[PDB]
Homo-oligomer: A and B are copies of this chain.
Amino acid sequence: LDNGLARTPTMGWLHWERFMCNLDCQEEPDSCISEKLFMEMAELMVSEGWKDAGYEYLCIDDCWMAPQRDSEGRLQADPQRFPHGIRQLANYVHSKGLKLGIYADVGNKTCAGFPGSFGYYDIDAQTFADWGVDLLKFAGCYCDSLENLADGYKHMSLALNRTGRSIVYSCEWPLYMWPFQKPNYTEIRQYCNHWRNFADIDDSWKSIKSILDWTSFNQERIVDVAGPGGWNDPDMLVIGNFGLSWNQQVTQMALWAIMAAPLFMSNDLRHISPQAKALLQDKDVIAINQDPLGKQGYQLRQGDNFEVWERPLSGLAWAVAMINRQEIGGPRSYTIAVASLGKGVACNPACFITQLLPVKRKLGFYEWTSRLRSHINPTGTVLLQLENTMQMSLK
């Protein structure tokens, strides 16, 4: 979308994978969906360096609404779970230096059953603008025709523009049309800031595998569409949760850095391991994600349960990720000629290679005819940064 926003991929926090639709504040007050949760999250986003690392958008997913609209036809928050209102929450998030997001749907209803924005596009866009909301995650549940889907997404895209407020417009437009339509992503880039491609992520290595395989299969149609202002959204980061190994978390962080992905956390910042915090606040990996050139990486090759991905970086640099997809055994050795990396120009005539994940170490200079050998853990990813001749005469 040509709104001057999402020039780098959007970084922040979303509550759906960790907290879901928890409406029981009587028995579980610390985990139900309330403004207390988001205010504690906004405190920890500054107090733990999440704001310093680049995460800024404290977004809200489903199950924030009252079951009915008000007498004026506007959306209203739940009186028990959000008594002080969305606008006061937005002011508290802006007072902490962060930005606040919110959720809505093109359909009659949202995905949980809360009221959607069909027939109320201008009204709800103005409501989120008056509340001070800086990001919209606009879902596509309970939509009856794809014409209604496309017209609702375009109507909200123009209606948020008519508010005059800078907003981030996250779409689920190609999410609910892939079983029966090939999406024309030029339209989706024209009307959205980033778009959800494949199905919803969960706390499993299965979802990481399926999302990466679907992205690598359709990479001829979605890579060149991605740029500053429009990104491919492979849902949320699930690092810091219950159902991923450490190598699988490293795989998700490295491949989200390669795919120019919007790094939306879904964890509990009150209860997070220091290792997941150090992985999610890695400077040299977020720098790959927030590369100012903003060109999405792609799968270079696959075979022998090995995947090699590369992303062009700004300033004659490249980012190379290698995945061992073999889920049996130990650290497997992989050797690749660096003349095949970066269309033959990434190491012409010499490139310095610095491994960033799973550990930060330097691997010395490699000439054009040289071969790079590394060891990759199963269900793990070795991510590396490659320089070129554009370096000082000091080494």
Contacts and interface: CB of A to CB of B under 8 A. Distances in A.
Interface stretch (A134-142, A172-180, A198-206, A293-301): A198-206
Nearest to A28: B333
Contacts of A315: none
B377 A242 contact: yes
Sorting the interface of chain A by its residue count into under 10, 10 to 19, 20 to 34 or 35 or more gives 20 to 34
Contact of A205 (B204, B330, B380): B204
Identify whether the interface residues of A are mostly helix, strand, loop, or mixed. Answer: loop
A246 to B, nearest CB: 8
B202 A328 contact: yes
Contacts of A380: 242
Interface in A226-265: 241-248
A147 interface: no
Given A243-B245, A329-B19, A205 B205 contact: yes
A380 B244 CA distance: 12
A220 interface: no
A205 B333 CA distance: 24
A243 B20 contact: no
A241 B328 CA distance: 9
A31 B332 CA distance: 10
A206 to B, nearest CB: 7
A203 B328 contact: yes
B243 A378 contact: yes
A97 interface: no
A327 B245 contact: no
Nearest to A247: B242
Interface in A264-310: 268
Among A22, A247, A329, chain B packs the most CB atoms within 10 A around the CB of: A329
24 contacts: A19-B330, A20-B328, A20-B329, A20-B330, A22-B330, A27-B333, A28-B333, A202-B327, A203-B328, A203-B329, A204-B379, A206-B327, A242-B245, A242-B330, A242-B331, A242-B377, A242-B378, A242-B379, A242-B380, A243-B247, A243-B248, A243-B327, A243-B378, A243-B379
Given A20-B328, A203-B379, A242-B331, 8 more contacts: A31-B330, A202-B328, A203-B329, A203-B378, A204-B327, A241-B378, A242-B378, A243-B247
